[PDB]
């Protein structure tokens, strides 16, 4: 009755949220690609720093690419069926999510080192952190799903289940360490490198201004994932649209961030 | 990047060691004293470090001692009459590769490469790399020599 009319009103708004997410993800993907080819054409791709940038962009490409395959996973018949390719698709998306955290940390390792110590060889340690450390973490996560939580294509949320901390705990830990780095870069930039005009110092200043802008942009969407707003009609609709706009345009935010640093 | 450059091909150690001849050294190859006594090696260290006198030092401390040696190497370069005119005509990335060479063979050794220096001073960077590879130095430490040579030819850090 009127209950059904209320049910139909929510399906339309969810279908609207779904449209915002699909269009934001297409625009983000094209943008990352256009940034990626701009970096590869440059003869400055030999600079360690541009090596770091190209790997970050690539990392966000694979994630946004596999988001499309994930949507095809969210069919409820597929969700319950627990097919092999279905769990494999979920671990792929999780692996790429971890790499995005470890590559943002990598940029923070380079910037703290570049302002304290005066390229093709040093990059391997960054590639070892960005792509390498994540692989055993996802693997350990997977064995934990297999022995203990083999359901819902590994995308189920269930209470009292700590299995997802195997990979989530690391993501928080490197973020903690990037905060210490930020405080040290600012601490250093304001006392000892106050008057420096060396080329590494001007670049450092441009980063810290940019990082201060991107951090609230990217940070909001993560705290919103804890909100639990409620069944209030007006509060619920705004919660769903804002969160869908922030998650989908995220890669677009990153591509602007990356090209700005090319200067 | 010069500190990163030399840390790569020379090496970095943060507690006092003794070299093949038996003196006390630290860092990227900072000789502390020729005296047998370990005591004097720690004291000579204390005056330089200007902090707690101990066998272990700060990685930052290593770069401040590294800077000291980079200073003395440049004073040596500029006193040498074959080395000096090639150095001023070179740019920064190419100077590092000249200092890299002095750290390895001394100002006297780099002066032996008489053809390659006139090539570097004429910007003839492709000609100089063939000269420096026909040499016993290239045969004895090839992996370091190939890195240094490429920096000369391109003037970038891509190799390190
Ligand atoms: C809150 O998550 C935002 C996005 N994120 C995880 C996944 O990305 C989509 C992330 N993870 C890490 C681990 N660090 C950072 C920084 C950062 C920094 O924050 C302390 C310090 C310094 Br110094 C540099 C930074 O990045 C360049 C920024 C700006 N985002 N970010």
Author numbering:
A (entry chain A): 103 to 220, 224 to 368
B (entry chain B): 1000 to 1159
Pull text from the paper.
Corticotropin-releasing hormone receptor 1 (CRF1R), a class B secretin in the G protein-coupled receptor family, contains receptors involved in critical peptide hormone regulation, such as corticotropin-releasing factor (CRF)- and urocortin (UCN1)-activated CRF1R2. CRF1R regulates behavioral, endocrinal, immune, and autonomic responses to stress in humans and animals. Therefore, CRF1R antagonists, which downregulate HPA axis activity, show great potential as antidepressants. We used the same CRF1R/CP37639513 complex construct, including the T4 lysozyme (T4L) insertion in intracellular loop 2 (ICL2), N- and C-terminal deletion, and 12 thermostabilization mutations, to obtain structural insight into the high-affinity ligand binding mode of CRF1R.
We observed the crystal structure of the CRF1R/BMK-I-152 complex at a resolution of 2.75 Å using an XFEL. BMK-I-152, which is located in the hydrophobic network of the allosteric antagonist-binding site, binds via various hydrophobic interactions and a highly conserved Asn2835.50 hydrogen bond. The top portion, the exocyclic alkyl amino group, forms hydrophobic interactions with Phe1622.57, Asn2023.43, Phe2033.44, Gly3246.50, Tyr3276.53, Leu3236.49, Gln3557.49, and Val3597.53. The middle pyrazolo[1,5-α]triazine bicyclic core forms a hydrogen bond with the highly conserved Asn2835.50 and hydrophobically interacts with Phe2073.48, Val2795.46, Leu2805.47, Thr3166.42, L3196.45, and L3206.46. The bottom 4-bromo-2,6-dimethoxy-aryl moiety hydrophobically interacts with Met2063.47, E2093.50, Gly2103.51, Leu2133.54, Phe2845.51, Leu2875.54, Ile2905.57, and Phe3627.56. We identified two hydrogen bonds (R1652.60–Q3357.49 and H1993.40–Y3276.53) in the central hydrogen-bond network. However, the stalk region in our structure adopts an alpha-helix form. The BMK-I-152 structure has an ~20% larger ligand surface area than the CRF1R/CP376395 complex and a higher binding free energy (−4.06 kcal/mol) than CP376395. Although BMK-I-152 exhibits highly potent binding activity (IC50 = 0.026 μM), its metabolic stability is poor because its dimethoxy groups are vulnerable to O-dealkylation. BMK-I-152 showed low liver microsomal stability (below 35% remaining) in almost all species because of the methoxy groups known for poor metabolic stability.
